[PDB]
């Protein structure tokens, strides 16, 4: 029976598009959103929903591909499902951004005031760098990529963005992950 | 030639990201758009056309600034410039031209790669009404209007519609005589 | 300062009193009959936006084939003015016939009969205006033309269609 | 070499044209031809417009003036005067500074053979009926044209 | 030493012709708060003098002759009697002492006459050029007669005839004296 | 040593202006607008009037105002000579204490830089103005808030332009 | 191989196939085994922690299970004693095919899988690996 | 609440049962008392009962609770293996009565299962080779001189009481007591005179004077007759309860304790010599003196039938009066040895042990620590009649309903711990088998319970599956 | 500067000619002018003023060519260019400036070294109404008009009339408006 998706492989096709092309597509995504939603909240949550779709795919993509040493022919072990919050956030740091933006995330910072909060920081946001000003609402797309990426793994969240310029980096963005209380309760029960 | 200039410009004078991100983003956009419009795919096609037009009207500036090519003396040269450096920079693909109609007014672009349409199967309601890469049609029309080459652009074949190979008709209507005073 | 810049151009036959229409509307304050363009400005507040209407005034047979080509291309609004004198009103037909060659269709177009003090007919202007979907004025030098200018600015701003719309003192894991 | 040479009076009128054509040492062209009048007006306007720009962006020392106006096709030069006589000179990109040549042309051809010539009508304005930019009186002194073309020959 | 510019004196010497024409005109616009006088320009004045009727032209020419008479009659403040007008009088009045001097009748032939160095008309009107530059010669005629006047020679015993057809404007001047 | 940079749209009208010297703003923004529109007018008249007799490529200057260039790889934007695009339009304006340089694009969008140095100067100017055009393509086209011909309101564009002119000036 | 199924986090089957009475009772056996599958989900060492393998038995119908990274549960009523490596390989193959299915941008996470290509290919995989 | 109104919960008052299994076990392993001629005729004249045995059978169980309004007794006819068929027909008739009678089911199923379990325990041979719990221990000879009877009647009755009969039994062991009635007054005085003569010469004596009824724990056979269909005076009920209390606490229990004293002093089919310690253990169990019972059983390690029963009741003694460890080392290994003995006797040639230990585990405090063992034994009996095995399925469903971790009582935390889905699956299995042995109210109750866990899902809920088939079945 | 520029031009560029000859020339010109005027001196002054206007109109072009000065908006610049360069070139006198009235619309130029009236002594009849160097006033009027500084200039003192010195009042009337085409 004919079909393409199940026949075409999914090993990493090491081929690259222009940053400008994706930047223009992102620009029109934001503009078309702006055309048809009144307030900032609706705009930014819709963009985070686009990111939600992207992330819910991307979790399976990255997790399956990291398994390797018709790709199931090559796999002798699958990567362990990420249970603890530390391991999944380490994966988001060292593999999700290393894949998506070609460089490991700057640093993974666990909060101190509130416990369920966690922080992942970008020095030079590699996708929204052309949006003028510091209207942070633009990069909720990336938040969505985190949200869905966490959400299927079993970690309901309310991920959001803030701009905290520091250290001679005018564009620094901190994405804060706010785990639901039940997630920390499961962390308490097991482990 | 155009080949060497486009190759160098893509190689070490433009930024590189992972194409999976680009195709996934476009898939998210078109999927949500299809859901929004009550599966009415005529409206989806028109909205994607308007989208692509709006990208192309700006992307012409980036293309010219990055490449800085002279004026286009004839439609054949526009086709070679397109297939050999334009898609080579942005999408990193080399389309082709295979239908040179009489007067050389029309030409059919061939998208053997089409990274926009990776991992896509269409719903059975969309199989006969929706063109997936229509943004890449609106872009061509909008960008070629900003160089006064007014062109009607549409799709004929599409692999996602089951065809053998996707293609995009580009028919130049009329060179606008609102060209820049120079 | 200004955040939006819109372009209007007022044109008509040579002997028409174009300047008296502009100056009362104009800003605080050459280049006409030299490059074919007299420029006026008015800042206005539209939905809290400081939008400037820049008005271009042109004429001249010796320079017609340079006025028409370049100063029409990106117009956000067009105004036709004719004095109540009849040759100008007849010329308004060829005017409206040669505007659309360079000006895009979606540019607002407005018509004015100027300098009353009635040696031309009145109903003919109204019906010819209604033929081409033309907001028409029958005025003399103010005379509420500024109100129509502000209305046109409002319509262009609408056509733009742009909606306006954690201490983190944590510890690194590396 | 040089492509043309124009003299405009302060009353917004063109009073001398010289349009070298074949680039010979004594190339045949047009002198005070009516055909250039439209072009004359255009040139005047261009100069006038740019003069206005240079009057706007003055530092404060002196109300200054335009030296060169280079398009993609040619390079213009101009040496204005207090009396309001614009001495325009078109040329190619071969030479850039014509200031000495313009100064010499003003100081020992126009001054010698037009200012100091009682027969020659200075100011070339009959009356108000043409003075305000209209009227096409030109300068046609034998000595002026002869010596001007004689001196200007080696650069065309 | 006594020194002044040269263009001023040279063009004033040129302008003594419109003097004579204007005075013979107004014998019969620009304003002052007390003088709304009726004025006439210069070049129109010389065109009128050329176009003027005859008898007025003799009167104007005699006026210029008298002007030059008074100009030269007192040239005795810098230190043959005829040759006084040739040796250095033209070295001050015009700078160029006359190139050709000869005697027996006295002919004085010069080239590149100074004050008319710039007076060429439209290119097609050479005959009007000479016919209109003619009156400027009379200033030297008055000068030579006046210098001869009172300097041990009778004014009436000599009549000075000036013209120019000799070999920018190389039509040199020729004077004959007794 | 540039003292002002400003850009103009196809319609005819200023869309961005910025000085770099100490308080040269003796002109209103309205006055700068009129100045730019008169530049457009004399562009329209300076190509219409060409010599009856007549009825090129910019060499790549190495590091004009240089040393991630937005979306451009490499330590400089480009490394080969390119071509002029306004063939018979106004290109320079020398003046007794400054020198204005003007650049044009196929899309009818115009750049102006007013240097105070007072042909190699034109070549260096078009190189620098191509750098500024690259910045325009980066931080003004990849902005969804920007309306296509209304004035620029980008801060990254301002920072990059000022960085370049301080590299030069 | 008595029954195979793929169930989502909402606990609805995105896809079930009945290989060729118990034919009526199979889904309830499956939905009952879901609880022990979830119990072994969160336990380190339940060494990949997705191939759970044998989870429950009901009259000797040894249910076996496997969990995807997105929480989709691949679980089947076998029957008997099952082989580790072959069942794991089949689970890997069907997981890869499901991942390819998930890429379809028109696909919802809750939409039942209805492409006949997927059905035919998992059938062929089973006959390669189980029969 | 009222223990009577849980064993007969179907005679509105739904609450939790406290520790009911232990009370049931004691109530079925209580001392047995006989009840005996012109006297049953007197009752039939007065109260519509065929014989006095039924009338006193309506006063079974705990005396101190005053059951009709801590030590139990049960009554049996005069003096003179797992018959699961009787149990099955009991279940069928009981369920038919329930259908005719009943409306929340949430405790009816619990009560019906507990009554099932109770009868399952008492369903061995009525006079076992070992299990002395069914032996009569106090023979209540009854007379009423007020009708006209006389001393010689009691003489002959006791004479006939003194001893085909079994070998284990020993008539001297059983303590006789003379119930003398009267209908009020001088009859009471001559009753005292006869009591004096009997006590001096023969035994003891009990003076007895002379709204509905809901009995329990008679035996397997009387309930069948009960299911094929009275009132009495409240003062009479109180008088009966008081005289039973005097008998049980001042005539029987003291005799029990004297007997136990003699046994334990003398301890430091078969009928004597080794019958001593086993009956001592049996009556130690009978009186809730558990630890001495366990010690006596442990000393008893000397056969196909006796040894298995001894080990079984040793384990039951441990259960009846509790951490993981002793279960790992004492209870379950003891039960396993009991099994091994039972399959050995089968090889020579059980269910009661399994259905007892299941509830005994299920009654413990730490539900999470040991419910699994009860599930294991119940599953071991699933390997008996159908209609009872349905109740066993229901019981496994109830057991799996209580395998939630105590440390919890969206919802991501709770998913991996609760086993509610298995409970729903077993409830549906019970519903199916109820549909087989066509019983519409039972399947109705089962589906009513199922609806909570199975309403949210839709694929299961669709037609073509047993949910739809059974929902349309009840129409 | 204006001073050094003027001295350079006068000393190095322009040559020499006798002052006394020029004074005799003006003596002859004014004498023969007033001869035919039957001693009427108001008409003489008017005609001399017209002469001076016509003189300055043509002399100004040679002036501007000799130097390289731009226009001047304010009358102060007219003062420095007149005192330092114009007179200092054309007849080599450095007249002073005084009597700067309010608004700087008037100023008096003092011409002590006036060679026009150097040794000439007037008769008593002439002293009443003759203005000897009125040609200078006419020249200043014509030249300042030629620069677009419309002006009125006439005498305030003359040594010949027995006044304190030779001084002329230059009085602005209006700065002329630069024209534009119609
Ligand atoms: C001659 O005048 C040259 C002009 C040619 C313009 C070419 C425009 C290139 C468009 C390429 C397609 C871009 C697709 C990516 C955007 C989403
Ligand atoms: C502002 O720039 C003014 C222009 C420069 C001054 C023009 C005045 C020149 C007139 C000089 C006349 C001198 C008298 C000569 C003897 C007759």
Residue numbers in the entry:
A (entry chain J): 41 to 109, 161 to 282
B (entry chain I), I (entry chain F): 9 to 190
C (entry chain A): 4 to 32, 36 to 91, 93 to 124, 129 to 152, 155 to 178, 191 to 199
D (entry chain G): 2 to 157
E (entry chain E): 37 to 64, 88 to 138, 155 to 179, 183 to 245, 253 to 263
F (entry chain H): 2 to 56, 65 to 76, 97 to 147, 169 to 218, 220
G (entry chain K): 2 to 21, 32 to 57, 84 to 116, 123 to 174
H (entry chain B): 3 to 13, 18 to 42, 45 to 77, 130 to 140, 152 to 173, 177 to 237, 244 to 264, 267 to 284, ...
What does the paper say about this structure?
Rab1 activation is controlled by its guanine nucleotide exchange factor, the multisubunit TRAPPIII complex. Our results show that the Trs85 subunit serves as a membrane anchor, via its amphipathic helix, for the entire TRAPPIII complex.
Here, we report the high‐resolution structure of the intact yeast TRAPPIII complex bound to its substrate GTPase Rab1/Ypt1, representing the key intermediate of the nucleotide exchange reaction. Although these data were of lower quality due to the higher tilt angle, combination of data from the three tilt angles provided sufficient orientation coverage to generate a 3.7 Å reconstruction suitable for de novo model building from 69,315 particles (EV2C–G and EV3). The GTPase‐like fold in Trs85 has multiple insertions relative to a typical GTPase protein and does not appear capable of binding nucleotide. There are two interfaces between Trs85 and the TRAPP core subunits: an extensive interaction between Trs85 and Trs20, involving 31 residues and encompassing a total surface area of roughly 2,250 Å, and a much smaller interaction between Trs31 and part of a largely unstructured loop of Trs85. Some small differences were noted; for example, we observed covalently bound palmitate molecules in both Bet3 subunits, whereas only one of the Bet3 subunits appeared to be bound to palmitate in the previous structure of the catalytic core. In our cryo‐EM reconstruction of the TRAPPIII‐GTPase complex, we observed a region of strong but unexpected density on the surface of the complex that we have confidently assigned as corresponding to a portion of the Rab1/Ypt1 HVD (and EV4H).
